[PDB]
Structures are given as structure tokens and as C-alpha cells.
Amino acid sequence: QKKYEQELFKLALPCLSAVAGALPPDYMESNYVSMMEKQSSMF
Amino acid sequence: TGGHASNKEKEMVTSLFCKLGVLVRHLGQTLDARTVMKTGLDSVKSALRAFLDNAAEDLEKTMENLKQGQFTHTRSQPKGVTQIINYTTVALLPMLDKHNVYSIYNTRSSRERAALSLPANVEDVCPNIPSLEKLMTEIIELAESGIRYTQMPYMMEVVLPMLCSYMSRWWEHGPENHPERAEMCCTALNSEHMNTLKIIYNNLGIDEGFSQPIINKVKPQLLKTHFLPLMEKLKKKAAMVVSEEDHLKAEARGDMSEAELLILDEFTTLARDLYAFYPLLIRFVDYNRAKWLKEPNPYWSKSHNFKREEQNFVVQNEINNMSFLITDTKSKMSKAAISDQERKKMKRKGDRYSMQTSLIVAALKRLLPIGLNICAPGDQELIALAKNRFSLKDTEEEVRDIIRSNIHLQGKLELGIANVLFHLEQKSKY
């Protein structure tokens, strides 16, 4: 975080909500991208 | 929210390392685990900050539990290589941990007892006959990351000194390697070989059962005095066994002695003199193949020996240049191999050259002109060799591509090395 990491607010919640998201599927799919960025990278 | 953010990185993986710990041993858990353990540890680069400064509640009580879960998973039936996540958490432990509150080292101690003597435990004593699950170099390199107290020990010092003494006694008894297949790099196993960190340790422990014999300084001094002739007379012209023996001697009797290094001035000077004279004896031979030492460890006599070796190598390189100027050799494969070997030898020499450049400059700054008079022919030969070269220029790219590891010790001021760096600028500054 170089430019401005000022306000947390929903810091890790967008990824903390579905860090256990790959539990239903068995394999395949293109959702497997990376895991270091997870948990905010720390009408 | 700080405590929640701290515990979400460790308690989650600690709890998740309980179903596959027995399911794998024998739906999409084998696929989501790859994301899970990377989110547990590799998601945060500076996990040591969250361990120490942010919240010390999780700390070792969760880190060692996750490590024990990983060890149990490796004991189970794995399929793919997942060493990156376990190896990327080595320096994050010390930079203490209250091991007395919770002792999560029982599983690691059991594994170490099961693997007490790797040359002697090559049998079916391990469950399910693991051909490559545990009986390989994987656990040997994993012990380097798991056991690392370079900054400061963070243990109860109850089983660690006894284990270190037992391993030292076993290595003293077994002079040769005697390892299994595909386990050549057995030297990088223990990174905490130090005092209190033919032996009579068993008798002393039986008699005490308050103060261990390793606390007294008589035993390490006696061990050092007994091991001094062994590494003093260690000189062989072989390429395989001599190299592995030199690596084993450097690993078991290294310079890492944090127990009052400055107090034993004579011992420190003797160790420095031996560690300076050993590479001279190693490089005294031709040593056409330079791939045996993957990464060697970095007064007037030593400086003179280094200058003489540099002059001899410069003469040899000049002779090779005049030999290759005319009488063209065979196809480009042999020439490329020769150039790659020469570049590897040059990099191996330049590592120690950059290591000793600061000492040479410090010695030559005050009143030493002999070092300058000896280094001037070396700089002249280095300038002449790089004045007009093409084969070395094109092979340097593939040499750097092959060697993905980099040291970059020029910026420390205290492709492993390139042709032009800070050491070259210091040499040319005069």
C-alpha cells in the first residue's frame, strides 16, 4: 500500500466473507488465481 | 478488531488442519486447502509484526500448532509439492515466545525422535513405507526453516540442547555421509549448531536426574579442541567425497558461535585463519567442475595468499585467452560449456573477492601499498579480459538465467555476482 492506506472500514471483510468460498466445488474453474491478496493482503 | 484481525490469520488454519489430517491419511477440501494455508501465512508478508507487536496472544501457541498440523499432513499421503508456504515462514519467528505456557513441540519432538539418525533410520520403521513422503531431502530442508534462532532463542531450552548434543554426538561418531538416494544436499539440515543450544552426555543426564553439563564451558572447549585436528588435517583431492566432507565440516564447525565470540579472541582468530586457509587449499587444485559447492560460506598471510591465487588465476585466464584466440575448437556447445564453467568459477572467486574487498580497502587505506601493487595486475587482467569478449558475453546471459539465486552482498556493505558492481567501482577508485 503505497499511495494512501488511510481508512480501513471494510478492510478485510470483502475477502473475510468468502475466504472459505472454494469449499463447495471440487476442482476445475478459473477462480483459482491467488491467495496472498486474500484477507486484505494481510430496489 | 485488532484481536480479530490477528486471530483470523492463525486460528482459521489451525482449526482447518484437523479434518484433512485424518481424511487424507485414510469434497473440494484438497483444492481449497491450497488457498487456505497461503491465506494463513503467506497472505501477510511481515507475519512477525502480527506475531510480536500487534498481538502476542496467538504467537507461538498458534504458530507451532499450525506447524504441527503441517507436519502431520506431510506424514499423511501428499500429492503435490507445497514446500513454499512452509519455507516462507522461517525468519518470521524471532524477528520472546513463552513456551512454558503451552508446549506445542511434542509432535516435532516425536518426529525428531523418529528421525534421530537419518543414515541409520533408512528402513521401514516409518509408517506406510514413505519412499518420498518424509524419507527424502524435503524434511531435511524443512528442518532449516522450522528450527532457526539466529536472532534469539524462543524456546524453553529443555529438549533443544539435548537434541543438539545428540545430533552432534551422532555426527562425531559418523564421519561419512551414508545417506539415502537423491539426498546429496544433507548438509543444510541444522541451522542452530551451537554450544548449549565418546560423549558423556547420557551419564551426566543420568547422574543429574539440576544443571546440565552443557551449561559448563569445559565441554564445548574440549569438543572444539578435539575437533580442531579433524578440520586441520581435512585435505583431500577428491571431487565428490572431499567436497561433501568439507561441507559437513563447515556446517558442523561453522563460525556461528554467539556464546561469547569476542571473549575467546584466540579461538576466533584461529577459526578465521582456518576459514581463510581452507578455500585456498580447495582452489589449489584445478577444479574444472565448480558445481560441487552450491553456496560456500563467505592479515598479511591471508592477503598474500589471496593475491597469489588471483595472480595464478589471471595467468591461467590469459593463457586460455591466447589459446582460444586462434586454433578454433569444435561446435558452439563445447565452447558454451567451457564459458559457463569459467563464468561459474569467476563468480565463485568474486564472491570471496567482494567479501574481502572491505578488509583489503581498510588495510590499504593507512599504510599498505603492497596490496595495491598486488591488485593492480589483477585489475589490469580484468580490464584486458573484458576489453573484447563475445562468447563470454553471450554465455553470461544463460549463466545468469540458470542460476536463479542472487546474493547481492554489495549493498549490505558488511546470478550471485555480476561483472561490474560496487566491488569493481571500489577497485577502480584506487
DSSP B332-400: HHHHHHHHHHHHHHHHHHHHHHHHHHHHHHHHHHHT--HHHHHHHHHHHHHHHHTTS-SHHHHHHHHHH
B337 exposure class (CB count in 10 Å sphere: 0-12, 13-18, 19+): exposed
Chain breaks in chain B (C to N over 2.5 A) after: 26, 95, 197, 209, 298, 414
Q: Provide the 8-state DSSP code for B51.
A: I
- Residue showing cell 584486458: B384
Selecting from B8, B9, B28 the residue whose C-beta is nearest the C-beta of A25 gives B28
End-to-end CA gap in chain A: 35
Q: Output the nine-digit C-alpha cell for B368.
A: 599498505
Pick the residue from chain B with its C-alpha nearest to A42.
B44
- Residue showing cell 595464478: B312
Based on its alpha-carbon atoms, the radius of gyration of chain A, rounded to whole angstroms, reads: 13
Q: Does A23 touch chain B (CB under 8 A)?
A: yes
Size of interface A-B (CB pairs under 8 A): 57
Q: Is the dihedral of CA B47, B44, B83, B247 positive or negative?
A: negative
- B374 CB neighbour count, 10 Å cutoff: 19
CA–CA dist B413, B187 (Å, integer):
28
Q: Provide the 8-state DSSP code for B253.
A: T
CA–CA dist B125, B113 (Å, integer):
12
Q: What is the largest CA-CA distance in chain B?
A: 76
Selecting from B5, B27, B44 the residue whose C-beta is nearest the C-beta of A26 gives B27
**Solving technique:** cryo-EM
CB hemisphere CA count around B118 (13 angstroms): 24
Give strand ranges (E) for B268-350: none
Nearest residue to B195 via CA among B264, B116, B266, B92 = B264
Stated length of chain B: 430
The amino acid that residue A42 corresponds to is M
Q: Output the nine-digit C-alpha cell for B99.
A: 513456551
Q: Does B49 touch chain A (CB under 8 A)?
A: no
Nearest residue to B237 via CA among B187, B284, B274, B275 = B284
Pick the residue from chain B with its C-alpha nearest to A15.
B39
CA–CA dist B244, B135 (Å, integer):
20
The amino acid that residue B184 corresponds to is M
CA–CA dist B218, B208 (Å, integer):
17
**In sequence order, what are the residues at sequence separation of 6 or more whose Cβ sits closer than 8 angstroms to the Cβ of residue B332?**
none
In angstroms, this model's resolution equals 3.7
**In sequence order, what are the residues at sequence separation of 6 or more whose Cβ sits closer than 8 angstroms to the Cβ of residue A28?**
none
* CB of B282 closer than 8 Å to CB of B309: no
CA–CA dist B343, B396 (Å, integer):
7
Q: Does A32 touch chain B (CB under 8 A)?
A: yes
CB hemisphere CA count around B292 (13 angstroms): 17
The CA–CA distances, whole Å, from B217 to A29, B212, B260, B348 equal 62, 11, 11, 37
Q: Which residues of B1-29 are buried (b: 16+ CB within 10 A; e: fewer)?
A: eeeebbbbbbbbbbebbeebbeebeeeee
Indicate yes or no: CB of B28 within 8 angstroms of CB of A27. yes
B47 exposure class (CB count in 10 Å sphere: 0-12, 13-18, 19+): buried
Indicate yes or no: CB of B31 within 8 angstroms of CB of A42. no
* CB of A19 closer than 8 Å to CB of A42: no
Q: Output the nine-digit C-alpha cell for B8.
A: 483470523
Q: Let me know the angle formed at the C-alpha of A35 by A34 and A39, rounded to the nearest 5 degrees.
A: 135
Q: Is the dihedral of CA B75, B76, B80, B84 positive or negative?
A: negative
Q: Output the nine-digit C-alpha cell for B34.
A: 491450497
Selecting from A16, A27, A35 the residue whose C-beta is nearest the C-beta of B35 gives A35
* CB of B392 closer than 8 Å to CB of B343: yes
The CA–CA distances, whole Å, from B346 to B16, B323, B339, B366 equal 50, 18, 10, 29
* CB of B159 closer than 8 Å to CB of B115: no
Nearest residue to B276 via CA among B293, B292, B300 = B300
The CA–CA distances, whole Å, from B302 to B72, B149, B276, B369, B371 equal 49, 31, 7, 16, 11
Of A19, A29, A31, A41, which to mutate for an interface test with B (greatest number of B Cβ within 10 Å)? A19
CA–CA dist B327, B335 (Å, integer):
13
End-to-end CA gap in chain B: 58
